[PDB]
């Protein structure tokens, strides 16, 4: 599981993405102009915690 | 003593036929009456 | 500077004690220049004109000039030491909208430099290397895909690579308490299957040919061959010679799992008449037959029975080593091990070369020292065939660019007449032909078949492994606690 | 036997999601929480979605 | 070459180019042994009866 | 137990097949760039 930390390299071709950050940002941007700004709560759950 | 021919004769001898099977992961009243 | 093309060099350093060591990665850029002309050579009969490509101009003078530029960059001879760590030719244009290509090239240069530093100074710098002991507490698995219609694999520049067979090696993980399932993909390998003419001579008063101790039917005359075209990491950041050994072990184990390599020919037979039809061997079997056979309406066992009458039941393992490319620095170790002995005078026992030592050491270190107990020190590991293969691409009728390595024996059987088949096989097999003569013969045939509509980019040489060494390697890997479970 | 994405969503997953939801609203004394639906998104989410 | 696109003029209209001939010049470096060519002029045409 | 035949059966076993080959007289850049 931790092979990359053992045998490491400075520049990596795979960095991953932030889908939860992208989707939450779009939803909040859509809601910011209507009258239902305070009716929704967004909860982020990630495997790191 | 008497006696070209097409083809590659060394290629036949370099073929790999089979390998060891240890590299593969292993799976997972009458008589006694008296 | 006295160089033929504009080049860029990427340099990085490492310090041990009070000394500095520098390593460089060289990138010639050739897009927009005229292609090289043909060179006249000397032959037994007369003069011949031999094709050339970009790599043919990178001689010793070029290396000396690059080294001088590198030394001027760091300050002088007293400021450190410099060495070349790799080389690759970039054949596609670079514009202001090519960020992705630049990032990929930078990553490749960084990996090459770091691996060179490790191999040269790991003991003094305390840098470890991959071995099979790191896979002790998990379950390795493998998978294979047979695909031959559509787009092909691509290299770092963007050119197609022939990928009839693809093998993937992974690692299986299960969470202890939550019971989730996942996998981690390590390395991948591509290749295809070729054929070699090899008749058996019974009339020489010899014993019958035995394969695995079993005799074969008298009509068998072709030897299957597997050619490896590429190998690359998937989720691993570093790719070293030990990682290459792991990929080789995985591929060999997967391809022999119940004759899984013949599935490639069986799958190709389903399309019908075409350039990769195995039914062309019907003309070999029966002389009167003059048209390739259609086998798209036969069951799998019928096709297997048909193949058993003409093919040897074994596989030959070969590899194509490019003269320059992304991983040529890694793969140059295979040619270096071909010469076992330096002819240097020996007090008692003949001296052994350094390339052989490096390859043997890699095999022994990956398996934690069992290969040494299984295989004798000094026996052959690699043979040279002597064939120089061109690299390039052409325009396919489906709208994509295809690898020039699509032209092989089966293509000639299906598309051309028997005289061309004889000429192609002869240039691959005859021992009284020099290298340039073989190159000229193959170039002429390809040019006639394609009407001259293709582009050449480089060269490659073909080598093959010793089967006894491979069997010993598989046994040693098993003795170190490593097992694999194919899934497909 | 083949598996797909939904096969990993067991009772442990439900318990963890409920705990995250309760931490979001303030505590057990601030209300009650229930799950109303579930759907897997298999396509990438970018800044133009 | 006779299948596909043809040659074009300065405005952008096609020109029949069944046969194309190129005249060049061959160069070799004296000491470094590099090989190159320099292309001068080209000609197009076809065959009639 | 139940069960002549023509031919010589001992002649086949006395045939000389092959002999040792030692009785015969014996006849008579990119990779390294950096």
Residue numbers in the entry:
A (entry chain B): 47 to 95
B (entry chain G), F (entry chain D): 584 to 586, 591 to 615, 626 to 631
C (entry chain A): 96 to 583
D (entry chain B): 145 to 193
E (entry chain H): 242 to 290
From the article:
In response, one family of large bacteriophages uses a nucleus-like compartment to protect its replicating genomes by excluding host defence factors. Combining cryo-electron tomography of nuclear shells in bacteriophage-infected cells and cryo-electron microscopy of a minimal chimallin compartment in vitro, we show that chimallin self-assembles as a flexible sheet into closed micrometre-scale compartments. We find that the shell is primarily composed of a single protein, chimallin, which self-assembles through its extended N and C termini into a closed compartment.
We next purified Goslar chimallin and characterized its self-assembly by SEC–MALS. Similar to 201phi2-1 chimallin, Goslar chimallin forms a mixture of monomers, defined assemblies of around 1.75 MDa, and large aggregates of around 10 MDa. The NTS, CTS1 and CTS2 segments of Goslar chimallin show near-identical interactions to neighbouring protomers compared with 201phi2-1 chimallin with the exception of CTS2, which is shorter in Goslar than in 201phi2-1 and shows a distinct set of interactions.
